[PDB]
Design a protein around this nucleic acid. Structure first.
Ligand SMILES: [Mg+2]
Ligand SMILES: [Zn+2]
Lengths: 153, 196, 190, 52
RNA sequence: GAUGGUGGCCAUGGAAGUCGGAAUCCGCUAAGGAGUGUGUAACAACUCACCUGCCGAAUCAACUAGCCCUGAAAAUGGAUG
């Protein structure tokens, strides 16, 4: 018997809000020793919203992070995170080039729910204006690149 | 706008018919967009399935009849929510693939029941906190091992029954949906021939 | 403006026979004979063609307030033809929260007595107008079946009992009680 | 305490109505202007707030 | 029928579109609006825009002026003579 459960964590921080107990409680597996393990396993994010799938068997669970386009672009837009102070208007400003957009799209096509590379770069360019940062310009400037001036595989 | 949306559709239906002298006239009836999208995404490399307005397709056929005098047979077969799928690989390999790519869809409240939906007696994993939905249907159940135990099977909906919200939610909770709708393709066009 | 001519035709099933006496109409079918008078509408009725397959109703030089009356006659005739060839069956269900509604049929459907409506001891006796029959149906807990020929009489009787089963001086948005018309149906299905 | 389909059947004759602002007439759910000529067949209507 | 990227981003105690401020785009698309509403502590669910299935000839909208109506309630019974 193999069970898979999807959870949402806040990154490398240990979840203060007890949300593992409502899920892992019914099967009897200890949730407190798994939540901190997920937090330390993620680690690098440490400031984002993270989705984690858990392959829990009758003996032990396996931890792996489900990739997300929004989670990848925000960590690509590296900025000093804000601590517990938690002020307003952390609207991210930055200029991420096109090179790493391709490799993020590789992770997007890894699970294979998309079109080919030329379509995934467009749908992640949509996520660029979704976040707020611009690739040396907005999507009106970044649409003509796909027209007769592309740099995609 | 609509004017160019009609023109380029005329362009893309002519172009699609130019290079595919073989097609299945497929009635995409009661098929979810999710199922259609995954089918098309999976089978894009082998075939292309196109849908649209029947009255516009038949006018395109009648407009192209001046160059293809063998397209009149398609005209009587265009009625209902029916489109085209084009492929050049084999004759029945895609037909078998379409028959195998059917996906069981969820039970929507308001749609007639196709055939023979019931629930066997078993110990689920829902829990004691969701028995109000079973009490709505009046199904007598017990609770054991911390979950809900079904005593006996029941034919909640017969063949050709209206699906209610209470039954639809119960089927969603049990993760059971015998409702499977796929391609119900009617005829085959192959260089001026009709096949079942 | 005044439209020169406005006409509509109604098909006539072979099992039924309809004839006109001036402007009133009489329809004879398997269930019985039903008549209706139209001496207040001032139109023309013509049973054109042998074997009485079609009936045409037309009006000449009528404003929009009276051209509307041309097609309502067609609906009346076709509804009447349905009520004579197949009849009308109105099924209405009793809705109550705590107190059951005791419905008793008397003088073979002519009178309906209602007891224990909201628990009050007052007995509601409603007399069906002639031409309809009431009966508490089987294969169901609470249900009343009204069978008749003309929709006016059948639905008027259903309205009478429905209006009789009313809650006053209270909030009707919570006290959802009374006998309510659930389904409009037909005695004989084609 | 009651079967839901019967409850909505009672609602269709008692709850889902449209009320005229003036004159406070009760109208069919798919109404546009009030039936009554007492208020002048005015256009403003409200959806008859349900029970909370 | 009415989908994914995606539970888009500031967001917040919980905010999956339905309380808020700025964005408001790409694939599959005949079509799906980071969305018109009903609701949810919030999710689910219902529903609208939009696209299709059936019949087939005309159909909407916003102004505008005529007659009539609501607006329009006083005392001795009452006046286009
Ligand atoms: Mg009171
Ligand atoms: Zn009014």
């Amino acid at each position: 018997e193999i069970k898979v459960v999807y959870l949402r964590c806040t990154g490398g921080e240990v979840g203060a809000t007890s949300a593992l107990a409502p899920k892992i409680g019914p099967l009897g597996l200890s949730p407190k020793k798994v939540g901190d393990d997920i937090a330390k396993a993620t680690g690098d994010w440490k400031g984002l919203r993270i989705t984690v799938k858990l392959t829990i068997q009758n003996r032990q669970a396996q931890i792996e992070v489900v990739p997300s386009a929004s989670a990848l672009i925000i960590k690509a837009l590296k900025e000093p995170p804000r601590d517990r102070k938690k002020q307003k208007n952390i609207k991210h400003s930055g200029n991420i080039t096109f090179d790493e957009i391709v490799n993020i799209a590789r992770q997007m096509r890894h699970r294979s729910l998309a079109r080919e590379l030329s379509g995934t770069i467009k749908e992640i360019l949509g996520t660029a204006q979704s976040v707020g940062c611009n690739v040396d310009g907005r999507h009106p400037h970044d649409i003509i690149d796909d027209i007769n001036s592309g740099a995609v595989e | 706008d609509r004017a160019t949306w009609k023109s380029n559709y005329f362009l893309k239906i002519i172009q699609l018919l130019d290079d595919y002298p073989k097609c299945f006239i497929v009635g995409a009836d009661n098929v979810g967009s999710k199922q259609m999208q995954q089918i098309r995404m999976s089978l894009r490399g082998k075939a292309v399935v196109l849908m649209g307005k029947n009255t516009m397709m038949r006018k395109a056929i009648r407009g192209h009849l001046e160059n293809n005098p063998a397209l009149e047979k398609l005209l009587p077969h265009i009625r209902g929510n029916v489109g085209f799928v084009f492929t050049k690989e084999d004759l029945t390999e895609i037909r078998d693939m379409l028959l195998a790519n059917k996906v069981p869809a969820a039970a929507r409240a308001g749609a007639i029941a196709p055939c023979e939906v019931t629930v066997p007696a078993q110990n689920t994993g829902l829990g004691p906190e969701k028995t109000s939905f079973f009490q709505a249907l009046g199904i007598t159940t017990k609770i054991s091992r911390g979950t809900i135990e079904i005593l006996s099977d029941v034919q909640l909906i017969k063949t050709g029954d209206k699906v209610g919200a209470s039954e639809a939610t119960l089927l969603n909770m049990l993760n059971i949906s015998p409702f499977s709708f796929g391609l119900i393709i009617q005829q085959v066009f192959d260089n001026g021939s009709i096949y079942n | 403006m005044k439209t020169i001519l406005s006409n509509q035709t109604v098909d006539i099933p072979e099992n039924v026979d309809i004839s006109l006496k001036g402007r009133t109409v009489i329809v004879k079918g398997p269930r019985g004979t039903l008549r209706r008078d139209f001496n207040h509408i001032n139109v023309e009725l013509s049973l054109l063609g042998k074997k009485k397959k079609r009936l045409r109703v037309d009006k000449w030089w009528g404003n929009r307030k009276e051209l509307a009356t041309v097609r309502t006659i067609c609906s009346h005739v076709q509804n009447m033809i349905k009520g004579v060839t197949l009849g009308f069956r109105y099924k209405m269900r009793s809705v109550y929260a705590h107190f059951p509604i005791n419905v008793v049929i008397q003088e073979n459907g002519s009178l309906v007595e209602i007891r224990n409506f909201l628990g009050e001891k007052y007995i509601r006796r409603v007399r069906m107008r002639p031409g309809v029959a009431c009966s508490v149906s089987q294969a169901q807990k609470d249900e009343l079946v009204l069978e008749g020929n003309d929709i006016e009489l059948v639905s008027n009787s259903a309205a009478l009992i429905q209006q009789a089963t009313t809650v006053k001086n209270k909030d009707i948005r919570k006290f959802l009680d009374g006998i309510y018309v659930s389904e409009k149906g037909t005695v004989q299905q084609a | 305490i009651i079967e839901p389909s019967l409850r909505q059947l009672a609602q269709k004759y008692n709850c889902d109505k449209m009320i005229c602002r003036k004159c406070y007439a009760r109208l069919h759910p798919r109404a546009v202007n009030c039936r009554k000529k007492k208020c002048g067949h005015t256009n403003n209507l409200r959806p008859k707030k349900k029970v909370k």
